[PDB]
Design an enzyme around this catalytic site. Structure first.
Site, PDB file in Angstrom:
ATOM      1  N   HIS A   1       0.213   3.148  -9.900  1.00 34.40           N
ATOM      2  CA  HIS A   1       1.651   3.088 -10.127  1.00 34.40           C
ATOM      3  C   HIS A   1       2.056   1.631  -9.950  1.00 34.40           C
ATOM      4  O   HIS A   1       1.558   0.953  -9.043  1.00 34.40           O
ATOM      5  CB  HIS A   1       2.353   3.928  -9.037  1.00 34.40           C
ATOM      6  CG  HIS A   1       1.910   5.364  -9.005  1.00 34.40           C
ATOM      7  ND1 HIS A   1       2.489   6.351  -9.772  1.00 34.40           N
ATOM      8  CD2 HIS A   1       0.852   5.939  -8.387  1.00 34.40           C
ATOM      9  CE1 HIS A   1       1.855   7.500  -9.554  1.00 34.40           C
ATOM     10  NE2 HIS A   1       0.850   7.266  -8.733  1.00 34.40           N
TER      11      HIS A   1
ATOM     12  N   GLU B   1       4.377   3.239  -4.341  1.00 37.29           N
ATOM     13  CA  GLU B   1       5.024   4.492  -3.963  1.00 37.29           C
ATOM     14  C   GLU B   1       5.256   4.566  -2.462  1.00 37.29           C
ATOM     15  O   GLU B   1       6.403   4.661  -2.006  1.00 37.29           O
ATOM     16  CB  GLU B   1       4.196   5.666  -4.494  1.00 37.29           C
ATOM     17  CG  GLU B   1       4.373   5.702  -5.989  1.00 37.29           C
ATOM     18  CD  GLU B   1       3.857   6.931  -6.674  1.00 37.29           C
ATOM     19  OE1 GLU B   1       2.886   7.595  -6.265  1.00 37.29           O
ATOM     20  OE2 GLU B   1       4.638   7.364  -7.533  1.00 37.29           O
TER      21      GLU B   1
ATOM     22  N   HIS C   1      -5.922   6.204 -10.616  1.00 48.07           N
ATOM     23  CA  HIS C   1      -4.859   5.672 -11.452  1.00 48.07           C
ATOM     24  C   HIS C   1      -4.010   4.776 -10.571  1.00 48.07           C
ATOM     25  O   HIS C   1      -4.221   4.694  -9.353  1.00 48.07           O
ATOM     26  CB  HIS C   1      -3.978   6.782 -12.033  1.00 48.07           C
ATOM     27  CG  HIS C   1      -3.322   7.614 -10.981  1.00 48.07           C
ATOM     28  ND1 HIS C   1      -3.936   8.695 -10.382  1.00 48.07           N
ATOM     29  CD2 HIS C   1      -2.145   7.441 -10.337  1.00 48.07           C
ATOM     30  CE1 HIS C   1      -3.134   9.192  -9.457  1.00 48.07           C
ATOM     31  NE2 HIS C   1      -2.046   8.436  -9.391  1.00 48.07           N
TER      32      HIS C   1
ATOM     33  N   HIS D   1       2.172   8.714 -18.442  1.00 43.18           N
ATOM     34  CA  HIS D   1       2.794   8.404 -17.154  1.00 43.18           C
ATOM     35  C   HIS D   1       2.043   7.300 -16.401  1.00 43.18           C
ATOM     36  O   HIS D   1       2.642   6.534 -15.645  1.00 43.18           O
ATOM     37  CB  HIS D   1       2.905   9.685 -16.307  1.00 43.18           C
ATOM     38  CG  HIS D   1       3.611  10.809 -17.007  1.00 43.18           C
ATOM     39  ND1 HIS D   1       4.977  10.823 -17.198  1.00 43.18           N
ATOM     40  CD2 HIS D   1       3.143  11.954 -17.561  1.00 43.18           C
ATOM     41  CE1 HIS D   1       5.319  11.927 -17.839  1.00 43.18           C
ATOM     42  NE2 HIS D   1       4.225  12.632 -18.068  1.00 43.18           N
TER      43      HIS D   1
ATOM     44  N   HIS E   1      -4.383   4.965  -6.525  1.00 36.49           N
ATOM     45  CA  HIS E   1      -4.629   6.312  -5.998  1.00 36.49           C
ATOM     46  C   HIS E   1      -5.994   6.766  -6.473  1.00 36.49           C
ATOM     47  O   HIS E   1      -6.182   7.021  -7.672  1.00 36.49           O
ATOM     48  CB  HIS E   1      -3.551   7.287  -6.463  1.00 36.49           C
ATOM     49  CG  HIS E   1      -2.239   7.028  -5.823  1.00 36.49           C
ATOM     50  ND1 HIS E   1      -1.043   7.516  -6.317  1.00 36.49           N
ATOM     51  CD2 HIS E   1      -1.939   6.336  -4.701  1.00 36.49           C
ATOM     52  CE1 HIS E   1      -0.061   7.128  -5.516  1.00 36.49           C
ATOM     53  NE2 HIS E   1      -0.580   6.418  -4.526  1.00 36.49           N
TER      54      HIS E   1
ATOM     55  N   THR F   1       2.563  12.946  -6.110  1.00 38.72           N
ATOM     56  CA  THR F   1       3.790  12.170  -6.285  1.00 38.72           C
ATOM     57  C   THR F   1       4.351  12.277  -7.689  1.00 38.72           C
ATOM     58  O   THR F   1       5.369  11.647  -7.979  1.00 38.72           O
ATOM     59  CB  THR F   1       3.568  10.696  -5.971  1.00 38.72           C
ATOM     60  OG1 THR F   1       2.685  10.145  -6.952  1.00 38.72           O
ATOM     61  CG2 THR F   1       2.976  10.516  -4.569  1.00 38.72           C
ATOM     62  N   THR F   2       3.699  13.032  -8.564  1.00 37.66           N
ATOM     63  CA  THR F   2       4.242  13.388  -9.865  1.00 37.66           C
ATOM     64  C   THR F   2       4.268  14.895  -9.963  1.00 37.66           C
ATOM     65  O   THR F   2       3.494  15.584  -9.283  1.00 37.66           O
ATOM     66  CB  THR F   2       3.388  12.838 -11.016  1.00 37.66           C
ATOM     67  OG1 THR F   2       2.036  13.301 -10.886  1.00 37.66           O
ATOM     68  CG2 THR F   2       3.403  11.341 -11.027  1.00 37.66           C
TER      69      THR F   2
HETATM   70  N1  LIG Z   1       0.074  10.346  -7.868  1.00 41.11           N
HETATM   71  S1  LIG Z   1      -0.956  11.347  -7.015  1.00 41.11           S
HETATM   72  O1  LIG Z   1      -0.107  12.020  -5.849  1.00 41.11           O
HETATM   73  O2  LIG Z   1      -2.242  10.568  -6.513  1.00 41.11           O
HETATM   74  C1  LIG Z   1      -1.546  12.642  -8.079  1.00 41.11           C
HETATM   75  C2  LIG Z   1      -2.875  13.003  -7.942  1.00 41.11           C
HETATM   76  C3  LIG Z   1      -3.390  14.000  -8.744  1.00 41.11           C
HETATM   77  C4  LIG Z   1      -2.560  14.634  -9.646  1.00 41.11           C
HETATM   78  O3  LIG Z   1      -3.082  15.659 -10.430  1.00 41.11           O
HETATM   79  C5  LIG Z   1      -1.230  14.254  -9.753  1.00 41.11           C
HETATM   80  N2  LIG Z   1      -0.307  14.864 -10.660  1.00 41.11           N
HETATM   81  C6  LIG Z   1      -0.622  15.122 -12.037  1.00 41.11           C
HETATM   82  O4  LIG Z   1      -1.690  14.851 -12.484  1.00 41.11           O
HETATM   83  N3  LIG Z   1       0.451  15.721 -12.796  1.00 41.11           N
HETATM   84  C7  LIG Z   1       0.369  16.137 -14.186  1.00 41.11           C
HETATM   85  C8  LIG Z   1       0.411  14.985 -15.161  1.00 41.11           C
HETATM   86  C9  LIG Z   1      -0.974  14.683 -15.723  1.00 41.11           C
HETATM   87  C10 LIG Z   1      -1.212  15.342 -17.078  1.00 41.11           C
HETATM   88  O5  LIG Z   1      -1.041  14.354 -18.055  1.00 41.11           O
HETATM   89  C11 LIG Z   1      -0.710  13.261  -8.959  1.00 41.11           C
HETATM   90 ZN   LIG Z   2      -0.532   8.509  -8.036  1.00 44.59          ZN
END
Ligand SMILES: NS(=O)(=O)c1ccc(O)c(NC(=O)NCCCCO)c1
Ligand SMILES: [Zn+2]
Length: 257
Positions: free
Chosen positions: A93, A103, A91, A61, A116, A195-196
């Site tokens: 986006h 985002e 990471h 992702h 982020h 956001t995921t």
């Molecule tokens: N975009 S965010 O709001 O900064 C954000 C910060 C920390 C997180 O843990 C997630 N979500 C997440 O990791 N979901 C599972 C997929 C990873 C496993 O491959 C999103």
């Molecule tokens: Zn993010």
């Protein structure tokens, strides 16, 4: 499984993650004229001098640069936060085109990408516990616009060839995330969510006013990554952003006028 395509993208997520339609979902549009300056907001304290990066991972992702979060080595404090939050990963986006990718938006403006920096509240002991709490995470969001190169991003750019496909990881030590910060730490803040998926409502969002500039070549290299695993049909990892969600009963606060 969820993703960013036509059949599994953000408009589908609520079927597996009903909190997608919840009361504090992220991202949001930051209407700069409606945000309220809060003079009680403290300056952010970013203490990254002892940061220990470990590895970079394509998770299908985005790509995550992961850090040792077993001690207070890279921490965020101050601002709207109470307590100490430890950096666990960062990471991005990004878009298929320079005109989209962020985002959060600012007066409906979309940036080319958004960084982020993810931190968890040490009072909860680990990241898994923290995401179950309304004040469990603090995510520092930084917009990227296309212009001059960001020298501190180049070590990230150069390793991406090693993690082209889902599930690939590489050693990524001695990376200094201070090289990704803008000059000013002026910020907006509001309560929100991941956001995921799982979209948990555990995030104090801190979004910096000042974007960083990255070069067209730097963001092009993001767009060469793949959502798929090796030996699967190639989908370019682009447009891995969730659009703005309803603000509902929330106020965005600004640390500056
Ligand atoms: N975009 S965010 O709001 O900064 C954000 C910060 C920390 C997180 O843990 C997630 N979500 C997440 O990791 N979901 C599972 C997929 C990873 C496993 O491959 C999103
Ligand atoms: Zn993010």
């Amino acid at each position: 499984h969820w993703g960013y395509g036509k059949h599994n993208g953000p408009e589908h997520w609520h079927k597996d993650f009903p909190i997608a339609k919840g009361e504090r979902q992220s991202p949001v549009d930051i209407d700069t004229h409606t945000a309220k300056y809060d003079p009680s907001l403290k300056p952010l304290s970013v203490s990254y001098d002892q940061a220990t990066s470990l590895r970079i991972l394509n998770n299908g992702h985005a790509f995550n640069v992961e850090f040792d979060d077993s001690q207070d080595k890279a921490v965020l404090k101050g601002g709207p936060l109470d307590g100490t939050y430890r950096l666990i990963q960062f990471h991005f986006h990004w878009g298929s085109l320079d005109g989209q990718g962020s985002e959060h938006t600012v007066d409906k403006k979309k940036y080319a990408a958004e960084l982020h920096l993810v931190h968890w509240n040490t009072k909860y002991g680990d990241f898994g516990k923290a995401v179950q709490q309304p004040d469990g995470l603090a995510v520092l969001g930084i917009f990227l616009k296309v212009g001059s190169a960001k020298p501190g991003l180049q070590k990230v750019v150069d390793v991406l060839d090693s993690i082209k496909t889902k599930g690939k990881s590489a050693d990524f030590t001695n990376f200094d995330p201070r090289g990704l910060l803008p000059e000013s730490l002026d910020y907006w803040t509001y309560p929100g969510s991941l956001t995921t998926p799982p979209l948990l409502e555990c995030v104090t969002w801190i979004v910096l006013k000042e974007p960083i500039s990255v070069s067209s070549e730097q963001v092009l290299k993001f767009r060469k990554l793949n959502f798929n695993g090796e030996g699967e049909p190639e989908e370019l990892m682009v447009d891995n952003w969730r659009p703005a969600q309803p603000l509902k009963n929330r106020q965005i606060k600004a640390s500056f006028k």
